[model samples]
Target: MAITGIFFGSDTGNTENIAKMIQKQLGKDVADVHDIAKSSKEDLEAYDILLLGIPTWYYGEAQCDWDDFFPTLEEIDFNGKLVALFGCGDQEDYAEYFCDALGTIRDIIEPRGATIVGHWPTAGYHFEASKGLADDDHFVGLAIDEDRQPELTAERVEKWVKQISEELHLDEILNA
Candidate 1:
């Protein structure tokens, strides 16, 4: 059975572009949709894991793409699937909610069924001044430091694919 990786994104196309990078790096079948036009609930059953891509929005919330995608998640049963979430953002300087995209999804899925994978990796551009930027352009929270945006995105996905592929005894995504 082949694994199905779904890539969804919203504004700036940053997150969406990152999704494609991961799909290609994982060498698995990938679903491309920037909006909520299609549903993967039917396809969910055939895969061992689900990789979701999201971008941070104003108010420290998720991009509008998830506004549609996440609500429809109740329609699918992701019980045994290992869900890994990747997010994109400039890390809004002083928002009370940093990287709220993944946190929001986790808040909803963990209590219901999905198990927290523990380590949530982040990607994307740096807007904060902590990395030495001028006022009004500084990212207030934190940066991954070794921000390997492209590689980091692929690395996290590959790591999850390897770990879950073994834990679930599913086909290796790289080989698949």
Candidate 2:
């Protein structure tokens, strides 16, 4: 069975809440959620599919917990793994760096051989710049602007969860 490891770094609880939402949508037994601060390399190594929730802090910085945990990830093996990223940011306050943390994680694990999933479209968002952009059309993953668009999070999460389920061919397991 392919299980998803959901890890998150949150200061205001927004990222952690989003991670819970993803797990709930994925079904309780299908994914295990963890705080990045308490996570070890073995936690990451236990799953082949990974769902990461990271929020961008002041001026495009990755959350401190993720920043610290990142070094451990650098030494971990990600070959034959799949990673999906999600980020929380204030689009209005930090428009230039909206959701940069999503890209930060991607840059790290992707080069190490993890195939990234759940790339999100950039539609309906008004941001000047972001490290999270996969291209002109998409973000590296789901991008949530909780400050300016809190109302959209649930809908986006739902769609992105479904998208990932389909992309990873987990529909049958999830539906079961």
Candidate 3:
């Protein structure tokens, strides 16, 4: 059976909460979540699909653990894996840089041969700018403004997991 390994870096716990929400939706049989601080390249490479969660710090930096772990990702070849990203940010406070950590993750993994899934629409967000934006309109993946719209997290995660499942042929994996 195929599995998704969810790796995340959190400072204030919002990203961890979002990761848990995604894992719950994806189900225990298919998804295993881990903290990037405790993760290694071999652990990440064990899965066929990866779900990476990051929290954008001030000025578009990824949370510390993700920043530290960036180099480790390059050590593993992602040629056969599908990767999806989710980011937590404060849109109200950092409108111009909201969810940039997702973009940071994308930039790194894409060059290492991972095929990315889960590009999200930019319709509902009020951000001024984001590196997370793809083609200047869509987000690279799920973007959560937990500080301003905490109520929407569950619904968004449900929708995103469904989107990713289809994109990654997860239903076939689940049924197999």
Candidate 4:
């Protein structure tokens, strides 16, 4: 099955809302959405295609909800799973740490053997520093600065959904 497990933690609803939008784009049958607060290690590992959402907190910190559940993520061996990540932050106030949560989770899962996809470019964003950058050109995942650029969220999400779906060949799998 080409079902995706979409899990996320949001302190102020920004991450959660964006996650829902992504789920809608992917279709209800194509994705399973959940809050990290209500998920378990087994619930997470059940899906081969995983979409993890995160939001940067004060001074470039990961949300506490993910922090509390962080250990459970370490339990899985992500060899066959394809993991994609998305994160939210403020590019203005937290420019130095914008979307750092994506990096935080990326660090843990990348070494565990998961294939990370949907890398987004950093061309339009202005940030002093970000661990979220996979390199100078791309972010570890789709990075969102909702607080500063709420208008861009819609387009960013749309393009990202297109990018990942094409990369994973979701159309063929879902058709099957």
Candidate whose lDDT is highest: 2
Per-candidate TM-score against the hidden true structure = 0.63, 0.93, 0.89, 0.90
**Segments in model 2 whose C-alpha atoms lie over 4 Å from true places:** 146-149
Q: Write the per-residue lDDT of candidate 2 for residues 1-176, one digit (tens) a residue.
A: 33899888888787777888888878877888888788888889889999888888888888788898888988778998989998867777677888888877888898788998999998755667888998878998988665565557888899999999998887778888
Question: In candidate 2, how many Å is residue 129 off?
Answer: 0.9
Better of 1 and 3 by lDDT: 3
Of 3 and 4, the candidate ranking higher by TM-score: 4
Q: Compared with the true structure, what per-residue lDDT tens digits does model 4 show for residues 1-176?
A: 43799888887677777888888877778897888888777786788889998888788877777988889888877877899998866667777888887877888887888998989998855667888898888898988665575457888988898889888787564445
Residues 47-96, candidate 1, lDDT per residue (tens digit)? 55566655566656666657776766666666766665555444445334
Whose lDDT is higher: candidate 2's or candidate 3's? 2
Q: Work out how many backbone clashes candidate 3 has.
A: 0
2 against 4, candidate with superior lDDT: 2
Worst 10 residues of 1 by lDDT: 132-141
In order, what lDDT does every prediction score? 0.50, 0.83, 0.80, 0.81
lDDT of 4 at 56: 81
lDDT for model 2 comes to 0.83
Clashing pairs in 2: none
